[PDB]
Structures are given as structure tokens and as C-alpha cells.
Amino acid sequence: GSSGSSGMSGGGVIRGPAGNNDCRIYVGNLPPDIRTKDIEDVFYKYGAIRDIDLKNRRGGPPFAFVEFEDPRDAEDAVYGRDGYDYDGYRLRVEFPRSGRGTGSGPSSG
Fold first, then answer.
1. Domains of the chain
2. Which of 10, 20, 21, 81 sits a CA distance of 20 to 30 A from 66?
């Protein structure tokens, strides 16, 4: 036995709340019956999570951001989770827009 329920459509959330931080990854193409926990125990396998922000509202599919403790991991996660299949539904993990800007030094004794 099986069946579907609940739909999705409309328009809103012109702009979401943003702050300033790193180790943040955006997860898209999520199911309607998704939970911040499932996503937690999901990316949790790649270490731990600091905080998860899920919007879930008129404006396409449900989206949320996962804040990892470390970047090296935050990437290792998206590096994989990006293209994962959950509940039969495909997920789209990718970093939020920001731009360029990556400097560094040689060492400097």
C-alpha cells in the first residue's frame, strides 16, 4: 500500500534572513515531510552540527542551512551529500552565494 498527500505551491519569502558565518551549507530538493533532525543525523555522520536553519514555506521546495563545526568537514559533507537520495527524493547540497575572496600566506617565521 502507498499514496501521496500534501502539495506545494505559491510565492513568498522574497528574501531570507542572513547574518555572517562560515561552515554553512544549503540543502535543497528536500521532501515535504522532512525534519531538521533527519538532516542532522544525516550530516552528523560527517562529524557534528552547530545549528540547522530550515525555512519551509511558500517558495519552491523546502530549504535549510546546516552549520558545521569545521569547514574541512562542512565541505567533505557537501562534497558527498551533494547528490544524495533520501526517501527516494534527490537532494541538492551546495554552498550559498557570496563571491570570491581567499587569501593566505606562505608561513612567515
1. 1-109 (3.30.70.330)
2. 10
